[PDB]
PDB file of C-alpha atoms in Angstrom:
ATOM      1  CA  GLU A1129      -0.026  -0.069  -0.271  1.00 35.37           C
ATOM      2  CA  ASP A1130       0.803   3.178  -0.376  1.00 34.97           C
ATOM      3  CA  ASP A1131       0.533   5.917   2.551  1.00 32.60           C
ATOM      4  CA  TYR A1132      -1.209   9.150   1.762  1.00 35.09           C
ATOM      5  CA  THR A1133       0.018  10.498   5.255  1.00 34.13           C
ATOM      6  CA  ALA A1134       3.317  10.415   4.291  1.00 36.88           C
ATOM      7  CA  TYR A1135       5.723  13.356   3.210  1.00 37.98           C
ATOM      8  CA  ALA A1136       8.453  13.778   1.094  1.00 36.79           C
ATOM      9  CA  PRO A1137      11.025  15.376   3.713  1.00 37.87           C
ATOM     10  CA  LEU A1138      13.974  18.161   1.546  1.00 38.54           C
ATOM     11  CA  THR A1139      16.761  19.065   4.474  1.00 36.44           C
ATOM     12  CA  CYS A1140      19.108  21.857   3.425  1.00 35.86           C
ATOM     13  CA  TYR A1141      22.226  22.456   5.616  1.00 33.79           C
ATOM     14  CA  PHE A1142      23.050  25.982   6.498  1.00 32.22           C
ATOM     15  CA  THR A1143      25.700  27.925   8.374  1.00 31.80           C
ATOM     16  CA  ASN A1144      24.888  29.254  12.070  1.00 28.47           C
ATOM     17  CA  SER A1145      26.107  32.728  12.972  1.00 33.39           C
ATOM     18  CA  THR A1146      24.809  35.512  14.989  1.00 32.01           C
ATOM     19  CA  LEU A1147      23.098  36.802  11.705  1.00 31.93           C
ATOM     20  CA  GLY A1148      20.861  33.801  11.225  1.00 36.38           C
ATOM     21  CA  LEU A1149      21.406  30.720   8.929  1.00 31.38           C
ATOM     22  CA  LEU A1150      23.937  31.146   6.042  1.00 30.88           C
ATOM     23  CA  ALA A1151      24.003  29.918   2.791  1.00 30.18           C
ATOM     24  CA  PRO A1152      27.680  29.329   1.566  1.00 29.21           C
ATOM     25  CA  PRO A1153      29.350  32.129  -0.356  1.00 29.31           C
ATOM     26  CA  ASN A1154      28.503  30.822  -3.647  1.00 29.92           C
ATOM     27  CA  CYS A1155      24.307  30.808  -3.122  1.00 30.60           C
ATOM     28  CA  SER A1156      23.971  27.354  -3.775  1.00 31.26           C
ATOM     29  CA  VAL A1157      22.628  25.274  -1.470  1.00 32.74           C
ATOM     30  CA  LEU A1158      23.340  21.611  -1.105  1.00 30.71           C
ATOM     31  CA  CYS A1159      19.983  19.842  -0.119  1.00 31.31           C
ATOM     32  CA  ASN A1160      18.784  16.141   0.068  1.00 34.25           C
ATOM     33  CA  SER A1161      15.403  14.269  -0.480  1.00 36.26           C
ATOM     34  CA  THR A1162      15.014  10.599   0.918  1.00 38.97           C
ATOM     35  CA  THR A1163      16.851   9.516  -2.539  1.00 37.74           C
ATOM     36  CA  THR A1164      19.172  12.349  -3.856  1.00 38.42           C
ATOM     37  CA  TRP A1165      21.773  15.459  -3.071  1.00 39.29           C
ATOM     38  CA  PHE A1166      20.918  18.225  -4.980  1.00 38.68           C
ATOM     39  CA  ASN A1167      21.198  21.812  -5.141  1.00 38.13           C
ATOM     40  CA  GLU A1168      19.219  24.581  -4.483  1.00 34.81           C
ATOM     41  CA  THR A1169      20.130  28.342  -5.311  1.00 33.25           C
ATOM     42  CA  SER A1170      19.179  30.630  -2.268  1.00 31.42           C
ATOM     43  CA  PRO A1171      16.383  32.941  -2.834  1.00 34.24           C
ATOM     44  CA  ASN A1172      17.896  37.012  -3.607  1.00 35.73           C
ATOM     45  CA  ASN A1173      18.369  38.702   0.005  1.00 31.08           C
ATOM     46  CA  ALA A1174      19.292  35.629   1.812  1.00 30.23           C
ATOM     47  CA  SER A1175      21.996  35.974   3.707  1.00 27.38           C
ATOM     48  CA  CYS A1176      25.283  33.551   2.922  1.00 25.88           C
ATOM     49  CA  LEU A1177      28.271  33.363   3.903  1.00 26.27           C
ATOM     50  CA  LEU A1178      31.445  35.697   2.662  1.00 24.17           C
ATOM     51  CA  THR A1179      34.602  34.355   4.767  1.00 19.75           C
ATOM     52  CA  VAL A1180      35.871  31.832   7.281  1.00 16.41           C
ATOM     53  CA  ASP A1181      38.903  33.919   9.399  1.00 16.26           C
ATOM     54  CA  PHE A1182      40.204  31.455  12.027  1.00 15.65           C
ATOM     55  CA  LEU A1183      43.135  32.134  14.064  1.00 15.69           C
ATOM     56  CA  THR A1184      44.379  28.833  13.445  1.00 15.87           C
ATOM     57  CA  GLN A1185      44.903  25.901  10.964  1.00 15.64           C
ATOM     58  CA  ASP A1186      43.500  23.747  13.410  1.00 15.44           C
ATOM     59  CA  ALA A1187      39.894  24.117  14.508  1.00 14.91           C
ATOM     60  CA  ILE A1188      39.429  22.517  18.135  1.00 16.54           C
ATOM     61  CA  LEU A1189      41.987  25.016  19.762  1.00 15.48           C
ATOM     62  CA  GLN A1190      39.286  27.833  19.497  1.00 16.65           C
ATOM     63  CA  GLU A1191      36.001  25.489  19.650  1.00 15.97           C
ATOM     64  CA  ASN A1192      35.069  26.527  23.032  1.00 15.53           C
ATOM     65  CA  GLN A1193      34.251  30.175  21.482  1.00 15.25           C
ATOM     66  CA  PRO A1194      32.573  30.857  17.757  1.00 16.90           C
ATOM     67  CA  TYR A1195      34.473  32.106  15.270  1.00 18.83           C
ATOM     68  CA  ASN A1196      34.827  35.481  13.460  1.00 16.83           C
ATOM     69  CA  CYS A1197      33.030  35.190   9.666  1.00 15.04           C
ATOM     70  CA  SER A1198      31.665  37.566   7.129  1.00 12.80           C
ATOM     71  CA  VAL A1199      28.323  37.487   6.132  1.00 14.09           C
ATOM     72  CA  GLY A1200      27.008  38.842   2.335  1.00 13.72           C
ATOM     73  CA  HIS A1201      22.921  38.287   0.526  1.00 13.14           C
ATOM     74  CA  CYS A1202      22.433  36.552  -1.928  1.00 15.51           C
ATOM     75  CA  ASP A1203      22.082  38.660  -5.346  1.00 14.59           C
ATOM     76  CA  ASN A1204      20.692  36.427  -8.402  1.00 14.36           C
ATOM     77  CA  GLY A1205      23.064  32.759  -7.289  1.00 14.62           C
ATOM     78  CA  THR A1206      25.695  35.518  -6.576  1.00 15.08           C
ATOM     79  CA  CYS A1207      26.395  36.556  -2.865  1.00 14.32           C
ATOM     80  CA  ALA A1208      27.014  40.259  -3.011  1.00 14.92           C
ATOM     81  CA  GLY A1209      28.003  43.482  -0.370  1.00 17.96           C
ATOM     82  CA  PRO A1210      28.316  45.274   1.743  1.00 16.76           C
ATOM     83  CA  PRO A1211      30.157  42.696   3.566  1.00 18.07           C
ATOM     84  CA  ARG A1212      28.941  42.621   7.859  1.00 20.29           C
ATOM     85  CA  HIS A1213      30.593  41.648  10.688  1.00 16.98           C
ATOM     86  CA  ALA A1214      29.516  38.220  12.302  1.00 16.63           C
ATOM     87  CA  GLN A1215      30.573  34.925  14.874  1.00 13.86           C
ATOM     88  CA  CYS A1216      30.197  31.466  12.959  1.00 15.25           C
ATOM     89  CA  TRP A1217      29.826  28.296  14.442  1.00 15.70           C
TER      90      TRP A1217
ATOM     91  CA  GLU B 285      33.415  22.619  22.831  1.00 16.25           C
ATOM     92  CA  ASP B 286      30.810  23.950  19.714  1.00 16.77           C
ATOM     93  CA  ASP B 287      31.507  21.444  16.420  1.00 21.71           C
ATOM     94  CA  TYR B 288      32.576  23.993  14.157  1.00 21.58           C
ATOM     95  CA  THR B 289      31.110  21.317  11.013  1.00 18.92           C
ATOM     96  CA  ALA B 290      28.227  20.805  12.470  1.00 18.42           C
ATOM     97  CA  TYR B 291      25.534  22.648   9.255  1.00 16.28           C
ATOM     98  CA  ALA B 292      22.207  23.345  10.508  1.00 14.22           C
ATOM     99  CA  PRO B 293      19.752  21.510   9.251  1.00 16.55           C
ATOM    100  CA  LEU B 294      16.006  23.021   7.853  1.00 22.03           C
ATOM    101  CA  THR B 295      13.522  20.105   6.844  1.00 25.28           C
ATOM    102  CA  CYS B 296      10.315  20.802   5.025  1.00 23.85           C
ATOM    103  CA  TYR B 297       7.479  18.963   4.146  1.00 25.42           C
ATOM    104  CA  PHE B 298       5.761  18.697   0.717  1.00 24.63           C
ATOM    105  CA  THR B 299       3.004  16.200  -0.712  1.00 22.52           C
ATOM    106  CA  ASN B 300       4.418  13.658  -4.241  1.00 20.94           C
ATOM    107  CA  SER B 301       3.184  14.095  -6.837  1.00 21.62           C
ATOM    108  CA  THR B 302       3.359  12.565 -11.072  1.00 20.06           C
ATOM    109  CA  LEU B 303       4.315  16.289 -11.746  1.00 20.76           C
ATOM    110  CA  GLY B 304       6.640  16.530  -8.876  1.00 20.20           C
ATOM    111  CA  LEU B 305       6.980  17.673  -4.344  1.00 17.95           C
ATOM    112  CA  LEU B 306       3.941  20.052  -4.038  1.00 19.85           C
ATOM    113  CA  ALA B 307       2.895  23.011  -1.289  1.00 16.96           C
ATOM    114  CA  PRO B 308      -0.303  22.769   0.373  1.00 15.86           C
ATOM    115  CA  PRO B 309      -2.552  25.652  -1.059  1.00 18.05           C
ATOM    116  CA  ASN B 310      -2.157  27.831   0.953  1.00 16.43           C
ATOM    117  CA  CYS B 311       1.433  28.193  -1.006  1.00 14.50           C
ATOM    118  CA  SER B 312       2.808  27.907   2.801  1.00 14.58           C
ATOM    119  CA  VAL B 313       5.018  25.178   3.918  1.00 13.33           C
ATOM    120  CA  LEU B 314       5.815  23.506   6.951  1.00 13.19           C
ATOM    121  CA  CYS B 315       9.188  23.339   8.289  1.00 10.98           C
ATOM    122  CA  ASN B 316      11.280  22.623  10.613  1.00 12.23           C
ATOM    123  CA  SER B 317      15.091  23.751  12.566  1.00  9.91           C
ATOM    124  CA  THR B 318      16.443  21.049  15.054  1.00 11.95           C
ATOM    125  CA  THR B 319      14.475  23.294  17.666  1.00 11.77           C
ATOM    126  CA  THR B 320      11.399  24.964  16.692  1.00 11.09           C
ATOM    127  CA  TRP B 321       8.570  24.337  13.758  1.00 10.13           C
ATOM    128  CA  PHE B 322       8.385  27.485  10.847  1.00 12.91           C
ATOM    129  CA  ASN B 323       6.215  28.348   7.920  1.00 14.74           C
ATOM    130  CA  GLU B 324       8.036  29.114   4.296  1.00 14.19           C
ATOM    131  CA  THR B 325       6.488  30.760   1.585  1.00 14.15           C
ATOM    132  CA  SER B 326       6.529  29.359  -2.019  1.00 16.60           C
ATOM    133  CA  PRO B 327       8.447  31.441  -4.148  1.00 18.56           C
ATOM    134  CA  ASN B 328       6.176  32.333  -6.922  1.00 17.63           C
ATOM    135  CA  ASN B 329       5.871  28.715 -10.424  1.00 17.21           C
ATOM    136  CA  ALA B 330       6.427  26.519  -7.495  1.00 17.91           C
ATOM    137  CA  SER B 331       4.001  23.295  -7.659  1.00 15.82           C
ATOM    138  CA  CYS B 332       1.112  23.773  -5.305  1.00 13.40           C
ATOM    139  CA  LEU B 333      -1.710  21.370  -4.445  1.00 13.73           C
ATOM    140  CA  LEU B 334      -5.564  22.482  -4.877  1.00 11.87           C
ATOM    141  CA  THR B 335      -7.421  19.903  -4.351  1.00 13.00           C
ATOM    142  CA  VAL B 336      -7.568  16.126  -3.483  1.00 11.27           C
ATOM    143  CA  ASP B 337      -9.926  14.298  -4.773  1.00 12.77           C
ATOM    144  CA  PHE B 338     -10.967  10.925  -2.457  1.00 14.24           C
ATOM    145  CA  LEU B 339     -13.137   8.472  -4.211  1.00 12.94           C
ATOM    146  CA  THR B 340     -14.078   7.122  -0.730  1.00 16.43           C
ATOM    147  CA  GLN B 341     -13.918   8.906   2.146  1.00 16.12           C
ATOM    148  CA  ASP B 342     -11.566   6.184   3.969  1.00 19.63           C
ATOM    149  CA  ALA B 343      -7.987   6.291   2.542  1.00 14.48           C
ATOM    150  CA  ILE B 344      -7.219   3.039   2.804  1.00 12.02           C
ATOM    151  CA  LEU B 345      -9.629   1.330   0.796  1.00 15.20           C
ATOM    152  CA  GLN B 346      -7.903   2.888  -2.804  1.00 15.93           C
ATOM    153  CA  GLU B 347      -4.555   2.906  -1.093  1.00 17.32           C
ATOM    154  CA  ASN B 348      -3.291   0.553  -3.196  1.00 18.23           C
ATOM    155  CA  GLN B 349      -2.974   3.513  -6.077  1.00 18.60           C
ATOM    156  CA  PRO B 350      -1.980   7.050  -6.380  1.00 17.67           C
ATOM    157  CA  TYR B 351      -4.691   9.794  -5.900  1.00 18.12           C
ATOM    158  CA  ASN B 352      -6.095  12.636  -8.120  1.00 18.86           C
ATOM    159  CA  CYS B 353      -5.006  15.785  -7.160  1.00 16.46           C
ATOM    160  CA  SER B 354      -5.292  19.058  -8.626  1.00 14.75           C
ATOM    161  CA  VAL B 355      -2.170  21.034  -9.185  1.00  9.89           C
ATOM    162  CA  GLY B 356      -1.457  25.376  -9.900  1.00 12.58           C
ATOM    163  CA  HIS B 357       1.631  27.448  -9.372  1.00 16.00           C
ATOM    164  CA  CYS B 358       2.256  29.805  -6.229  1.00 19.17           C
ATOM    165  CA  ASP B 359       1.708  33.479  -7.222  1.00 20.28           C
ATOM    166  CA  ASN B 360       2.949  36.336  -4.839  1.00 21.76           C
ATOM    167  CA  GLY B 361       1.349  33.485  -2.304  1.00 22.91           C
ATOM    168  CA  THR B 362      -1.410  32.111  -3.271  1.00 22.55           C
ATOM    169  CA  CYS B 363      -2.123  28.913  -5.476  1.00 22.86           C
ATOM    170  CA  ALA B 364      -2.893  30.291  -8.585  1.00 23.21           C
ATOM    171  CA  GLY B 365      -4.464  28.431 -12.063  1.00 23.88           C
ATOM    172  CA  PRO B 366      -5.060  26.641 -14.518  1.00 23.53           C
ATOM    173  CA  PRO B 367      -5.129  23.657 -13.056  1.00 26.36           C
ATOM    174  CA  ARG B 368      -3.366  20.217 -14.021  1.00 26.71           C
ATOM    175  CA  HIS B 369      -4.268  17.371 -12.988  1.00 26.84           C
ATOM    176  CA  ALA B 370      -1.936  14.989 -11.564  1.00 28.94           C
ATOM    177  CA  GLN B 371      -1.554  12.193  -9.220  1.00 30.32           C
ATOM    178  CA  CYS B 372      -0.633  12.293  -5.492  1.00 29.96           C
ATOM    179  CA  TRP B 373       0.335  10.118  -2.933  1.00 32.14           C
TER     180      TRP B 373
END
């Protein structure tokens, strides 16, 4: 039998920041259904990650706090400025 | 410690159809983070469910096959026509 009551879930993956959930620097969000990966282009004015600014090469040494990151906004699939200073985790 | 490698997942829920995944008739998709529900207005031209057309009140009696449904497209948060005939499950 089919289950008419079961919705099809789609899950998309974002970076946590003090300016909210971020799309990647290419404004292309990675997503999955129950059977496949797929990309979604972020909508215009969505927040996107521009840069991750770590102090060292070894994340665990600074992972008791968030890290510094620059945040832009999506404009026709490009992460546009001006950049804003956030904390990411 | 924080886990810099962990993305924040957001999951949204759609109806399966022969015309692809559908938003509800109000073009408002139900979603959740790991801590909360939230709604998202579907983007313009997304497919939306207009009607579910069951033959009986008791779904299990027809659940060996999909059910008949009408499909529209979202226009500024309203499910617009013309309607298309699909099978939903």
